[PDB]
Amino acid sequence: SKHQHPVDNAGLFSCMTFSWLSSLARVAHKKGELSMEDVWSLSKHESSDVNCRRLERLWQEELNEVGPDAASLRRVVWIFCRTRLILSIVCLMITQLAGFSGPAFMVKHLLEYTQATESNLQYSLLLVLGLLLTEIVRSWSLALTAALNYRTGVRLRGAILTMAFKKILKLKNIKEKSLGELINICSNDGQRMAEAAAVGSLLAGGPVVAILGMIYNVIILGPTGFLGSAVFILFYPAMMFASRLTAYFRRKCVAATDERVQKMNEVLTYIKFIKMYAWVKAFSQSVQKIREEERRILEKAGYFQSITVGVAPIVVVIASVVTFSVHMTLGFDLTAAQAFTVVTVFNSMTFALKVTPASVKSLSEASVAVDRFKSLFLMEEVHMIKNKPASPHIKIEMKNATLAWDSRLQRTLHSIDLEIQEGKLVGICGSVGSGKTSLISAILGQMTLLEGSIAISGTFAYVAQQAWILNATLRDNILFGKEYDEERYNSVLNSCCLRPDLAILPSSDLTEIGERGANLSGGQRQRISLARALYSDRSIYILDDPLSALDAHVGNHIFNSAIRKHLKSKTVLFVTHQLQYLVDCDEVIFMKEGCITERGTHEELMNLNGDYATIFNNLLLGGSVPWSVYGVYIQAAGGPLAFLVIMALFMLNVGSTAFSTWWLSYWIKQGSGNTTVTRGNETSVSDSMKDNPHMQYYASIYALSMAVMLILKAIRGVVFVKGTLRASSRLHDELFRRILRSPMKFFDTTPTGRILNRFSKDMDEVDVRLPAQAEMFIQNVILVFFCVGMIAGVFPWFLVAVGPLVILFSVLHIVSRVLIRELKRLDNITQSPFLSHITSSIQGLATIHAYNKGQEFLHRYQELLDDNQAPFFLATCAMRWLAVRLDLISIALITTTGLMIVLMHGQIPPAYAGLAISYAVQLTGLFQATVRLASETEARFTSVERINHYIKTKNKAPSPDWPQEGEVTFENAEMRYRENLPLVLKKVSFTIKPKEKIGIVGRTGSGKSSLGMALFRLVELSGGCIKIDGVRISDIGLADLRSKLSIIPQEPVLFSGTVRSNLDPFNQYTEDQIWDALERTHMKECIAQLPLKLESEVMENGDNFSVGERQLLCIARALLRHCKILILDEATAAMDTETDLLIQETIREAFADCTMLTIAHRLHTVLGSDRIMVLAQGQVVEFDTPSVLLSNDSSRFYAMFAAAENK
């Protein structure tokens, strides 16, 4: 025994057969759920610390030997992994030698014995035992070499991830890389390296058995054997070519699918505007046009992908046909054993296309990860000041320090003579870019030194800008790895006045805040950072501006409560940006261009009449998938007929190869037509296929069988893709149709992102991932069924031997895959906390570096890495554990087939026995693929299930001229937003009459926002009646209702595409009317100067236009329709001193001859209206015209107007 982990306790046989996992497999099967407690802890050999130390030692050794610039991290990886890679390579060599010598020798000798006229029992038994032993030791050696590299990949990932984390923690240039790269390299590069070391180490595998096969087939045959090798070496860079073509088709049309996702997001977020404008048909047409363009390249991508999914038997059949059709017709002889040895070795070399491309892609990923890690390891490292001042009273000492920045020595500071003393309240103020932040960073230690010296005699309590903080509960953010003291905690809370924050928070001390703060604000974040700094109890406090945008009153209160009183015995480096915080400061310094100009306390600062005094004066002045899915999936695919057609086509595709093999066996068995050939003085029939009179007929039938197989494969490839894509298209169309027609309440309750997830992730998965795995699963299942049926046909006793084996396979399947699903779930729910403490760590590094808490952070990161890697290691080992048990069935089937062949010697033709053993040795590696494909399809069906259930859960004839007038009346309308919700409309009744300027305004939540969509009938009326032009709103069609109405929302909304498309999506309005509307809204010149003349294209939300132009575009909208009732919402504050007035001028100039149901929350912009109503809590209380309402002081509206004037 070496460790508590059963992996170390396992010897040779247990490790080879993965017997250690059958102590957790049983408990997982019995309980049905695997938790982190049941998962064994990581071994000390695979522990992060030891492997990281070894990797660092090797890296430093190579850096010292070769050089910082000429070193290679690939050499470091090779040196680290050589010990566990050499033995794995040897094991792969021996297992691939056994797997090649099995069919080449054991099958050939067995078939030669079958053709022999004698009958030997001991020899046949010895041959069967030898073949069984060879296959058993091949499978076991493969399992051993997989387990050997699985551990070293995990240990390499663990060693490199912590080293990368330490490097990014100790780097100086935080902004050198991006946010999405530092997190990716510490979370995905390690996994890429692990999977590379796991699967790509077999690069010396498939190729070596392939070249061994090429060397073979030339001794038994003649020169014809080179044609079989040429066929393989031309077919490989054809499946590779198809894979490259499908990869090129991928990452293409991704722009189209991103445009579709953006359009769906725009139609979901701005669904109120579209539903209030009847712009549904045009948007639906737009998305249909985008989708049909997407599934025009998606169809080709699927066509090219479906070629290389099941090529395992097709390549062997093609090579055999090409070899035999020219070997027989050239006069050469061919026997059953001679012909079937080539087929068996071709099937053996077939076990390269499944692994080699994956190995190459893993090696490429490992190489690019190594290059990126090397680039990470070559940047400058941050430094910490260790020199101390000669006088202990001096805290920070620096004399004539250049202290250049980086870009590299970027000169920013010049001749700084700081003499900071212990216990001071100084402040370094200056212009932006003069070197204030540069000086702060230099004090922290992230600055290089050229001339002078830097002396620090204490730790830094530095708070960073933007308040990065941590990503945990609001208790460790204040302690920051310190002992919890009640008195200190209460003092810190009282100093920073955090009691109201705790009171308003739901969980108070237990409240959880994200990396940036979800239920938090900038001021609260800064207060939390200040509290953490106060509780830190350090010597020097590097106080970066905490109150730049926090507040004034409470900011001064916390400043004079904590910085002045609590922070008296500690050094203060408070940056200052307002200049009233240094009235009590001990020494005020003002530095410009990196040089100190004024020193001393404040009194000298004003009496010297410097720049600081001028600035101060200026500032003072200023799961299981049910059967419903499978069924509906196929029902959406076209019903039972489509599934039956697909199944029949797959069976025909497999049966093409099956019939080719059967015809080859028939040609071998038929002999020379039972004719006699004169070989001299003896004439006694013949036993050579070359003497068969109908040899050309057999060759032609073989060639036709190959052609038919190719045609069937092409037909399946071009049909199955269409069948699996039409289902996705129909599902997407139905989902869009039901979502667009669904009440708005579905949008208010269900989040927009949740709906969008069904069109960006679920839809893409359904389109590209699930059909790909389903095709291979179906192909493997049909191939296995056909092989089993044909094997049983030759010997009518395979069913009785396979029945118990089928039961064993079913028992294995039900026992397993549960510890796989649970292990994957555990890996995900341990990697999510691994993304925690990583995204936060990269987001904020200056605070960590200044506080010197880089050791406990690294320890926590290593602990998280180990607790995430252990489930990953177990999950990786589970695949090989299942593969061993499935091989225990595969080799058993092969042994049973061989025993049946040897027992029935003389009653079975050699070709029939040979085909059986060829298919038996072809059965290898099929159950392992089949179960994995079934599990993957079951997992992928969760997306289809999530998509599903979403589609599950006249009277009055309007006049052609309606509305002739703009008369609006309300008859005690009763309305509510949703059921079981507080009422928003309470017996509201009023009269508008055409030609009005209603200036509706009320308190928040009173019901002002309800009006608008209330008139448009976004949700059905719960009571009351509303009449337009004497006609009730109800009992009218949706288009008729929301087609003669217009409204401009609060925030301008613009759709991506074309300006013409935004102005006229239906394309039925004349250009002259559009230009007249633009002229009336004052657009003309500034929009006519565009190079494309209004076809200039608009980005998302109109990001290429100014805010004023964005508002003016929406103002110009609804002018073309010349609608009567306008329900223009709030203008979202005033824009400048002229743009707002111009907008108002255009607004009243355009909509002058019609009603004006404008809603504005500003009392200054509502003045001059013809008549204004005031609605409070859903009741009308004031209808008497602003003017008349004004004279009356008792009216509320006058009180609000006076309050607004006062404020």
Author numbering: 95 to 501, 573 to 787, 839 to 1169, 1179 to 1432
Could you give the paper's own sentences about this structure?
The first group consisted of hydrophobic amino acids, including Trp240 (TM2), Tyr244 (TM2), Phe288 (TM3), Val293 (TM3), Phe452 (TM6), Phe988 (TM9), Met992 (TM9), Phe1091 (TM11), and Phe1145 (TM12), which applied hydrophobic forces on the peptide. To validate these hydrophobic interactions, we generated an hMRP5 mutant with six binding pocket mutations - Trp240A, Phe288A, Phe452A, Phe988A, Phe1091A, and Phe1145A - denoted as hMRP5-m6. High-resolution cryo-EM structure of hMRP5-m6 revealed a similar overall conformation to the wt-hMRP5 and hMRP5-Δ1-94, with separated NBDs. However, the C46-S64-derived EM density was absent in the hMRP5-m6 binding pocket, confirming the importance of hydrophobic residues in anchoring the C46-S64 peptide.
